Structures are given as structure tokens and as C-alpha cells.
């Protein structure tokens, strides 16, 4: 019964920043591990970052480590992705998703209940 | 096929010979020689299309293989040594799966 919807996005200049949010419905968001994925044109969804239910552990794909920060506010039923030092390679649809099982993983199959996505475009 | 770890199914490898890991230290080498058969010889993984690249496939393969092995007594030294040998096996497994995928 926890469903998801991304907000934020739009256009950002190279080297700029922006923040995405992922709002959750239902009553048990705080019990779910969560993840962000992205899908570049003509490709499949691939891992960006994940965070455990409590927020105490996070994980990132190498190409975003140190530039992106995943966080969550369990009191507000929302997860965030703070994206800094944007690069042309970051243009994609970004999706949030709920973790399956007890362990955050990087595989696409480790998550479900995908949001409809939001678009990020690095200006050119 | 269809293995479940930590409540998530869909995990997939055949047994591999465990090689010696050379740590550059006498004590670690001796400890590894003593304990290497307590460590995995088969790795858990997921289909290659679920990852962008080898590094992400291998990360899951190492993490989940060690979790499955240690939840089913291993110290922090054992985990660190398992990370070395399981990484090699996960790389081998990725190359097998990648070749099959590109056919």
C-alpha cells in the first residue's frame, strides 16, 4: 500500500545543483528500504543510490559518489536526492522505488513499486 | 535458480576452486590458508541486465554471497578475507554471464 511519486526536476546547468523528492503514500514508508534509479535515453533503469529504512546506511553507484546525496525524512514520508556538480551524463528520467527484502542492493530487481519518474536535463 | 536471500528471490553459480589469496603478510597468509575452506565456493548473483556494468554486478555478488554465507563463527577478519576471494569469483561469474548475454 505504500506508493510513490517523484517531484522536482527540470533543467540544470553543468556544475549546478538540484534536489529531487519522492513522496510516499500509506502508513509504513519508514519501514521500507528505498532506492533511486535513472534511465537515460535508449537505456534501461540503472542504480543511482539507496538508503535503509532507518536512514542509517546508504549506497551509491561510483559515478555519483561525492556528488549526489540520498536522504529521507520518515516523519514527512519523503525521500530526497540532492544532486550536485551536474554533468551532461546525468540527463535521464529519475525513478524512486521501494526495496524488496531486507538488504539494499544495486540490481534493478531489488526494488519495485516504481514511481512514474521525473525528468532531469543538463543544459546544452 | 530462483534462490531467496533476505526475503528477496530471483537470485542465481557453479562451484569454483578456492584459490590462495596472497596478502603480502605472513600472518594473514597463514590465517587464510587455515580458514579458506570455511569461505564460499559458489556465488549468488542476478541477471546482468539488472546492472549498468561489471562493478555494480560484482558489488551485489560479493555483498549477498557473504551475507548468505554468514547468516546461514565468522569474525571481522573472516569477512575481510571473504571479500577478497569472493570478489575474484564474482568477477569470473560476471564474465561468464556477460558472454552468454551478448551471446
mmCIF file of C-alpha atoms in Angstrom:
data_model
loop_
_atom_site.group_PDB
_atom_site.id
_atom_site.type_symbol
_atom_site.label_atom_id
_atom_site.label_comp_id
_atom_site.label_asym_id
_atom_site.label_seq_id
_atom_site.Cartn_x
_atom_site.Cartn_y
_atom_site.Cartn_z
ATOM 1 C CA UNK A 1 0.000 0.000 0.000
ATOM 2 C CA UNK A 2 2.993 2.376 0.064
ATOM 3 C CA UNK A 3 3.067 4.010 -3.375
ATOM 4 C CA UNK A 4 5.476 6.628 -4.651
ATOM 5 C CA UNK A 5 5.654 9.766 -6.772
ATOM 6 C CA UNK A 6 8.684 11.832 -7.744
ATOM 7 C CA UNK A 7 8.757 15.638 -7.737
ATOM 8 C CA UNK A 8 11.457 18.116 -8.686
ATOM 9 C CA UNK A 9 13.467 18.019 -11.868
ATOM 10 C CA UNK A 10 13.642 20.256 -14.907
ATOM 11 C CA UNK A 11 16.727 21.948 -16.337
ATOM 12 C CA UNK A 12 20.115 22.442 -14.658
ATOM 13 C CA UNK A 13 23.355 23.914 -15.942
ATOM 14 C CA UNK A 14 26.560 21.833 -15.881
ATOM 15 C CA UNK A 15 28.121 22.189 -12.448
ATOM 16 C CA UNK A 16 24.784 23.242 -10.952
ATOM 17 C CA UNK A 17 22.586 21.519 -8.395
ATOM 18 C CA UNK A 18 19.002 20.447 -7.858
ATOM 19 C CA UNK A 19 17.012 18.286 -5.461
ATOM 20 C CA UNK A 20 14.514 15.557 -6.289
ATOM 21 C CA UNK A 21 11.869 14.326 -3.882
ATOM 22 C CA UNK A 22 9.947 11.044 -3.710
ATOM 23 C CA UNK A 23 6.663 11.298 -1.791
ATOM 24 C CA UNK A 24 5.157 8.130 -0.325
ATOM 25 C CA UNK A 25 1.561 7.193 0.452
ATOM 26 C CA UNK A 26 0.318 4.805 3.093
ATOM 27 C CA UNK A 27 1.449 4.442 6.666
ATOM 28 C CA UNK A 28 4.657 2.392 6.548
ATOM 29 C CA UNK A 29 7.180 4.357 4.447
ATOM 30 C CA UNK A 30 9.528 4.332 7.448
ATOM 31 C CA UNK A 31 9.691 0.515 7.302
ATOM 32 C CA UNK A 32 10.907 0.359 3.669
ATOM 33 C CA UNK A 33 14.397 0.487 2.288
ATOM 34 C CA UNK A 34 14.301 2.848 -0.706
ATOM 35 C CA UNK A 35 16.208 3.496 -3.919
ATOM 36 C CA UNK A 36 16.762 5.918 -6.774
ATOM 37 C CA UNK A 37 17.351 4.714 -10.339
ATOM 38 C CA UNK A 38 17.753 6.579 -13.612
ATOM 39 C CA UNK A 39 17.021 5.782 -17.247
ATOM 40 C CA UNK A 40 18.969 7.584 -19.953
ATOM 41 C CA UNK A 41 17.522 7.758 -23.484
ATOM 42 C CA UNK A 42 17.506 4.330 -25.116
ATOM 43 C CA UNK A 43 18.770 2.530 -21.985
ATOM 44 C CA UNK A 44 17.225 0.664 -19.083
ATOM 45 C CA UNK A 45 16.807 1.802 -15.483
ATOM 46 C CA UNK A 46 20.079 1.626 -13.568
ATOM 47 C CA UNK A 47 21.034 2.144 -9.943
ATOM 48 C CA UNK A 48 21.841 5.585 -8.554
ATOM 49 C CA UNK A 49 21.545 5.383 -4.763
ATOM 50 C CA UNK A 50 19.774 3.587 -1.928
ATOM 51 C CA UNK A 51 19.010 4.122 1.750
ATOM 52 C CA UNK A 52 17.863 1.802 4.500
ATOM 53 C CA UNK A 53 14.505 2.212 6.233
ATOM 54 C CA UNK A 54 16.056 3.959 9.248
ATOM 55 C CA UNK A 55 18.310 6.156 7.090
ATOM 56 C CA UNK A 56 21.416 4.815 8.822
ATOM 57 C CA UNK A 57 23.080 3.287 5.722
ATOM 58 C CA UNK A 58 23.291 4.462 2.115
ATOM 59 C CA UNK A 59 24.884 3.222 -1.095
ATOM 60 C CA UNK A 60 25.787 4.856 -4.414
ATOM 61 C CA UNK A 61 26.905 3.955 -7.890
ATOM 62 C CA UNK A 62 30.529 5.014 -8.307
ATOM 63 C CA UNK A 63 29.865 7.761 -10.865
ATOM 64 C CA UNK A 64 27.679 9.763 -8.446
ATOM 65 C CA UNK A 65 29.530 9.188 -5.173
ATOM 66 C CA UNK A 66 30.538 12.508 -3.650
ATOM 67 C CA UNK A 67 28.185 14.419 -5.984
ATOM 68 C CA UNK A 68 24.750 13.060 -5.036
ATOM 69 C CA UNK A 69 23.361 12.544 -1.533
ATOM 70 C CA UNK A 70 20.353 10.361 -0.734
ATOM 71 C CA UNK A 71 18.373 11.122 2.410
ATOM 72 C CA UNK A 72 14.932 10.564 3.865
ATOM 73 C CA UNK A 73 12.548 12.221 6.289
ATOM 74 C CA UNK A 74 10.492 9.455 7.837
ATOM 75 C CA UNK A 75 8.288 11.983 9.674
ATOM 76 C CA UNK A 76 7.299 13.522 6.316
ATOM 77 C CA UNK A 77 7.039 10.283 4.288
ATOM 78 C CA UNK A 78 9.535 11.549 1.709
ATOM 79 C CA UNK A 79 12.941 10.600 0.323
ATOM 80 C CA UNK A 80 15.299 13.057 -1.383
ATOM 81 C CA UNK A 81 18.172 13.057 -3.853
ATOM 82 C CA UNK A 82 20.426 16.109 -3.634
ATOM 83 C CA UNK A 83 22.305 16.295 -6.938
ATOM 84 C CA UNK A 84 25.415 18.482 -7.078
ATOM 85 C CA UNK A 85 28.040 19.173 -9.751
ATOM 86 C CA UNK A 86 25.726 18.048 -12.526
ATOM 87 C CA UNK A 87 27.301 16.601 -15.653
ATOM 88 C CA UNK A 88 25.880 16.019 -19.145
ATOM 89 C CA UNK A 89 25.905 12.259 -18.399
ATOM 90 C CA UNK A 90 23.280 12.829 -15.662
ATOM 91 C CA UNK A 91 20.416 13.665 -18.057
ATOM 92 C CA UNK A 92 17.752 10.977 -17.562
ATOM 93 C CA UNK A 93 14.385 10.108 -16.138
ATOM 94 C CA UNK A 94 14.884 9.506 -12.402
ATOM 95 C CA UNK A 95 12.707 6.965 -10.582
ATOM 96 C CA UNK A 96 12.249 6.148 -6.932
ATOM 97 C CA UNK A 97 11.325 2.637 -5.821
ATOM 98 C CA UNK A 98 10.692 0.537 -2.707
ATOM 99 C CA UNK A 99 13.267 -2.014 -1.619
ATOM 100 C CA UNK A 100 12.470 -5.734 -1.725
ATOM 101 C CA UNK A 101 13.792 -7.930 1.061
ATOM 102 C CA UNK A 102 15.933 -6.798 3.966
ATOM 103 C CA UNK A 103 19.117 -5.808 2.062
ATOM 104 C CA UNK A 104 19.675 -2.761 -0.120
ATOM 105 C CA UNK A 105 21.222 -3.914 -3.387
ATOM 106 C CA UNK A 106 22.085 -2.287 -6.709
ATOM 107 C CA UNK A 107 20.180 -4.608 -9.057
ATOM 108 C CA UNK A 108 17.020 -3.316 -10.693
ATOM 109 C CA UNK A 109 15.329 -6.443 -9.304
ATOM 110 C CA UNK A 110 15.978 -5.329 -5.742
ATOM 111 C CA UNK A 111 13.138 -2.769 -5.908
ATOM 112 C CA UNK A 112 9.540 -2.422 -7.072
ATOM 113 C CA UNK A 113 6.545 -0.057 -6.842
ATOM 114 C CA UNK A 114 8.408 2.295 -9.197
ATOM 115 C CA UNK A 115 7.217 5.876 -9.397
ATOM 116 C CA UNK A 116 6.206 7.336 -12.729
ATOM 117 C CA UNK A 117 9.538 9.188 -12.848
ATOM 118 C CA UNK A 118 10.719 12.762 -13.252
ATOM 119 C CA UNK A 119 12.959 14.292 -15.906
ATOM 120 C CA UNK A 120 16.342 15.921 -15.320
ATOM 121 C CA UNK A 121 18.048 17.672 -18.244
ATOM 122 C CA UNK A 122 21.536 19.121 -18.034
ATOM 123 C CA UNK A 123 21.522 22.165 -20.298
ATOM 124 C CA UNK A 124 23.443 22.157 -23.573
ATOM 125 C CA UNK B 1 17.995 -20.705 -9.951
ATOM 126 C CA UNK B 2 15.322 -18.765 -8.081
ATOM 127 C CA UNK B 3 17.180 -18.554 -4.775
ATOM 128 C CA UNK B 4 15.952 -16.342 -1.927
ATOM 129 C CA UNK B 5 18.297 -14.331 0.295
ATOM 130 C CA UNK B 6 16.993 -11.882 2.885
ATOM 131 C CA UNK B 7 13.425 -12.316 1.661
ATOM 132 C CA UNK B 8 14.205 -11.423 -1.962
ATOM 133 C CA UNK B 9 14.038 -14.128 -4.611
ATOM 134 C CA UNK B 10 15.350 -14.260 -8.139
ATOM 135 C CA UNK B 11 18.986 -14.814 -7.206
ATOM 136 C CA UNK B 12 21.081 -17.175 -9.289
ATOM 137 C CA UNK B 13 26.795 -20.037 -9.708
ATOM 138 C CA UNK B 14 28.530 -23.366 -10.124
ATOM 139 C CA UNK B 15 31.213 -24.336 -7.639
ATOM 140 C CA UNK B 16 34.672 -22.888 -8.238
ATOM 141 C CA UNK B 17 38.014 -23.955 -6.836
ATOM 142 C CA UNK B 18 39.015 -21.664 -3.983
ATOM 143 C CA UNK B 19 42.466 -20.232 -4.773
ATOM 144 C CA UNK B 20 45.068 -18.948 -2.371
ATOM 145 C CA UNK B 21 44.901 -15.198 -1.745
ATOM 146 C CA UNK B 22 48.302 -13.542 -1.282
ATOM 147 C CA UNK B 23 48.016 -10.755 1.295
ATOM 148 C CA UNK B 24 51.651 -9.643 1.491
ATOM 149 C CA UNK B 25 51.795 -10.565 5.186
ATOM 150 C CA UNK B 26 52.822 -13.866 6.768
ATOM 151 C CA UNK B 27 50.101 -13.940 9.428
ATOM 152 C CA UNK B 28 47.291 -13.112 7.011
ATOM 153 C CA UNK B 29 48.553 -15.686 4.514
ATOM 154 C CA UNK B 30 48.724 -18.356 7.220
ATOM 155 C CA UNK B 31 45.305 -17.433 8.598
ATOM 156 C CA UNK B 32 43.834 -17.569 5.093
ATOM 157 C CA UNK B 33 45.411 -20.961 4.373
ATOM 158 C CA UNK B 34 43.937 -22.229 7.644
ATOM 159 C CA UNK B 35 40.422 -20.852 7.083
ATOM 160 C CA UNK B 36 39.900 -20.749 3.312
ATOM 161 C CA UNK B 37 37.615 -23.805 3.180
ATOM 162 C CA UNK B 38 35.187 -22.120 5.600
ATOM 163 C CA UNK B 39 34.564 -19.495 2.889
ATOM 164 C CA UNK B 40 32.211 -19.743 -0.124
ATOM 165 C CA UNK B 41 32.983 -21.587 -3.354
ATOM 166 C CA UNK B 42 29.722 -20.583 -5.116
ATOM 167 C CA UNK B 43 28.468 -17.022 -5.629
ATOM 168 C CA UNK B 44 24.985 -15.524 -5.675
ATOM 169 C CA UNK B 45 24.237 -13.049 -8.448
ATOM 170 C CA UNK B 46 21.419 -11.551 -10.503
ATOM 171 C CA UNK B 47 20.984 -11.301 -14.294
ATOM 172 C CA UNK B 48 23.438 -8.899 -15.923
ATOM 173 C CA UNK B 49 20.677 -6.718 -17.414
ATOM 174 C CA UNK B 50 19.831 -5.607 -13.856
ATOM 175 C CA UNK B 51 23.146 -3.691 -13.683
ATOM 176 C CA UNK B 52 24.827 -0.909 -15.632
ATOM 177 C CA UNK B 53 28.270 -2.524 -15.552
ATOM 178 C CA UNK B 54 30.565 -5.110 -14.022
ATOM 179 C CA UNK B 55 31.324 -3.075 -10.888
ATOM 180 C CA UNK B 56 27.681 -2.948 -9.807
ATOM 181 C CA UNK B 57 27.056 -6.629 -10.579
ATOM 182 C CA UNK B 58 30.169 -7.575 -8.595
ATOM 183 C CA UNK B 59 29.207 -5.354 -5.663
ATOM 184 C CA UNK B 60 25.894 -7.189 -5.196
ATOM 185 C CA UNK B 61 27.509 -10.580 -5.812
ATOM 186 C CA UNK B 62 30.108 -10.001 -3.084
ATOM 187 C CA UNK B 63 27.657 -8.465 -0.607
ATOM 188 C CA UNK B 64 24.880 -11.053 -0.987
ATOM 189 C CA UNK B 65 27.211 -14.063 -1.198
ATOM 190 C CA UNK B 66 28.859 -13.098 2.089
ATOM 191 C CA UNK B 67 25.544 -12.266 3.763
ATOM 192 C CA UNK B 68 24.071 -15.625 2.732
ATOM 193 C CA UNK B 69 27.165 -17.458 3.976
ATOM 194 C CA UNK B 70 27.432 -15.664 7.319
ATOM 195 C CA UNK B 71 23.732 -15.671 8.228
ATOM 196 C CA UNK B 72 23.429 -19.392 7.435
ATOM 197 C CA UNK B 73 31.681 -18.398 13.672
ATOM 198 C CA UNK B 74 32.851 -15.696 11.261
ATOM 199 C CA UNK B 75 34.761 -12.697 12.607
ATOM 200 C CA UNK B 76 35.521 -9.347 11.000
ATOM 201 C CA UNK B 77 38.835 -10.794 9.789
ATOM 202 C CA UNK B 78 36.908 -13.606 8.083
ATOM 203 C CA UNK B 79 34.588 -11.106 6.392
ATOM 204 C CA UNK B 80 37.541 -9.086 5.083
ATOM 205 C CA UNK B 81 39.189 -12.191 3.650
ATOM 206 C CA UNK B 82 35.908 -13.414 2.178
ATOM 207 C CA UNK B 83 35.628 -10.054 0.437
ATOM 208 C CA UNK B 84 38.917 -10.734 -1.372
ATOM 209 C CA UNK B 85 38.211 -14.264 -2.601
ATOM 210 C CA UNK B 86 34.503 -13.731 -3.313
ATOM 211 C CA UNK B 87 35.330 -10.644 -5.396
ATOM 212 C CA UNK B 88 37.544 -12.754 -7.665
ATOM 213 C CA UNK B 89 34.832 -15.392 -8.062
ATOM 214 C CA UNK B 90 32.192 -12.725 -8.741
ATOM 215 C CA UNK B 91 34.375 -11.238 -11.485
ATOM 216 C CA UNK B 92 34.731 -14.688 -13.047
ATOM 217 C CA UNK B 93 30.970 -15.170 -12.768
ATOM 218 C CA UNK B 94 30.292 -11.794 -14.392
ATOM 219 C CA UNK B 95 32.486 -12.652 -17.373
ATOM 220 C CA UNK B 96 30.579 -15.921 -17.825
ATOM 221 C CA UNK B 97 27.191 -14.184 -17.633
ATOM 222 C CA UNK B 98 28.271 -11.264 -19.838
ATOM 223 C CA UNK B 99 29.492 -13.553 -22.619
ATOM 224 C CA UNK B 100 26.234 -15.524 -22.507
ATOM 225 C CA UNK B 101 24.180 -12.310 -22.621
ATOM 226 C CA UNK B 102 25.930 -10.831 -25.650
ATOM 227 C CA UNK B 103 25.731 -14.410 -26.986
#
